[PDB]
Amino acid sequence: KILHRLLQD
Amino acid sequence: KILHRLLQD
Amino acid sequence: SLALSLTADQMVSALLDAEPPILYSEEASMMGLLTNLADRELVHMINWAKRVPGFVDLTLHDQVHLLECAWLEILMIGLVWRSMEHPGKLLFAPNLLLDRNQGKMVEIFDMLLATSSRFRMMNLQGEEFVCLKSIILLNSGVYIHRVLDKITDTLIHLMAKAGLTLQQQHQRLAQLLLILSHIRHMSNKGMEHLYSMKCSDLLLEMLDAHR
């Protein structure tokens, strides 16, 4: 899940 | 168009 | 014109007495019911719209555009209004109440649900509801200015009389108007559903107008 990851970062 | 008609009377 | 010459109380009157009646109902079964109900409510909507101050001041061609654009929004805000008192279900007609266990749409069924419960918590009043509905008619296809400003005053007028403070007045306004964005959303999604069922001539001409 790209959007989830980049938000985690 | 039916809407044309209904809007008149 | 005329609308701009109306006081807040008159504006509320005009609208309250333009209110269409609540009609009674009669996958293939449920939708035949909604389309049949919807089709009959359209006739009442057309004549109600004309009783909305400022609408008559529009050319026939402009009047046809706003209705083609907003009708499903008009139907939906009415449905959600009827469904306030019935948490968990939607009241299309006094004899037609449906739960999400039948909508299987189901996602749209839910959005309409959440929308109705939102009106409940806000304790949305009838006068507020009639204002919101006239707003959807005039604003949705607008892309009216001074007519819309008037209803705003009317809404604030209503809240003030309700005893709300200066701050409370402007955030209830905000909250209320924000829900029109969601109703615009539900309408567009719904219009897609109506289109797949088509893969009455009036409802077909209404759908085509949007696509």
Add this chain to the structure above:
Amino acid sequence: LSLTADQMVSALLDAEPPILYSEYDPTRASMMGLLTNLADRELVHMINWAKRVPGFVDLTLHDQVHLLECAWLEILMIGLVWRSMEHPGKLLFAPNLLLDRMVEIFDMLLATSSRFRMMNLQGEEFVCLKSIILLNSGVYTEEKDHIHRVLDKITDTLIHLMAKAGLTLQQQHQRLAQLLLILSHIRHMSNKGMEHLYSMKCKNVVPLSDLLLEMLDAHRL
């Protein structure tokens, strides 16, 4: 929630994302490639801007994803229209990509931008609206209660700005309404956008990025 109206303002403006360039070659599907490519690249900035919106961090990752999934195109579009002001009859997708009149979508964008112009929309007002769209787009689709209070707080800000602008109360009320009413049309433009963006996939002529497709699949169609 602790922020003063001015703090919120200043906080939003310093969180503002940059205006990216397209790969438009003022030499030589084409433009559409430029649009989706540009959008994808802006998304990365939108994410880190969204986290700099007061209240957004307080939400669970799960809710934040849904909110961005719902609002991304509404956010891009209002950004575009803001830029596209003082550019009567043209859309400024990028400093290097200024266009004249899916043409319907373009015309609605044109109309919208024109409104902010005639309204004399201000930068502080712009960042409030954008923060609203992010918090309101998918709030309906004890964490929402928390969104409304923030939404109420952003509303107190807008008013504050209008009060400072010298507008009478009736004027703040009316101006506040106009702006919010405009968000409804931005919702409509988004919905239509998603539809065309969906055709382009099944068209497989347009080049969608993996992130753009994941966004599109959240919205379903």
